[PDB]
Structures are given as C-alpha cells and as structure tokens.
Amino acid sequence: GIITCICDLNDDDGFTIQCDHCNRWQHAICYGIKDIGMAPDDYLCNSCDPREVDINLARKIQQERINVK
Amino acid sequence: ARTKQTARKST
Ligand code: NA
Ligand SMILES: [Zn+2]
Ligand SMILES: [Zn+2]
C-alpha cells in the first residue's frame, strides 16, 4: 500500500491505480484516468515505463486538492 | 488494472 506518483504528493486522493510491475500505487487522475472505465487492462507507472504524461498538471491538481482541504 | 476508489456519500 505505497503511493508513489508523478505529483510527488503521495497521500490518498480517493482513486488510485496499482502499477502492474512495481506494485506501487498512483493517483489515477495524475495519469489522465478520470474513472475506472478509463483504466486499461494493462497498466505500468511512469517509473516502470516512461510515458508522455503531464507532470506539472498532476502536481497542480494534487496541490490544489491539498490546498483546499 | 487494479484500482481502489473511495466513495463518500451523505443521506
Ligand atoms: Na507508464
Ligand atoms: Zn499524483
Ligand atoms: Zn511501477
């Protein structure tokens, strides 16, 4: 149950997805996965498989969640 | 993939 995500704000945001390889968890929204339906059969985090992904946007979304708690 | 999702509701 470790969250390791591209936002570097690794607390539970309520919707996480588990990397198939390293078994660490990411925030689905940081990876553009808005709901369960957007999650593919196979899934690897950005550490296990570098991808094009908007890291600044991920940080912005998560930092905003934290800032308005 | 394997997912965890928490739903918060109020009735
Ligand atoms: Na990836
Ligand atoms: Zn994240
Ligand atoms: Zn991984």
Q: Which two tokens stand for residue A42?
A: 């196979």
Tell me the C-alpha distance between B5 and A12, whole Å: 10
Work out the minimum CA distance from B9 to partner chain A, whole angstroms: 13
Q: Which ligand is nearest to the CA of A62?
A: 2
Tell me the C-alpha distance between B10 and A50, whole Å: 40
Tell me the C-alpha distance between A43 and A25, whole Å: 11
| Helix, strand, coil shares, percent, chain B, to 5 | 0, 35, 65
CB contact under 8 A, B3 and A42: no
Resolution (angstroms) stands at: 1.7
Tell me the C-alpha distance between A27 and A24, whole Å: 11
Where chain A is broken, by preceding residue (C–N > 2.5 Å)? none
CB contact under 8 A, B4 and A43: no
Q: Give the residue from A66, A44, A68, B8 showing the smallest Cα distance to A7.
A: A66
Method underlying the structure: X-ray
Tell me the C-alpha distance between A54 and A31, whole Å: 8
Superfamily for A1-69? Answer: Zinc/RING finger domain, C3HC4 (zinc finger) (3.30.40.10)
B1: nearest CB among A12, A15, A40: A40
Tell me the C-alpha distance between A11 and A45, whole Å: 16
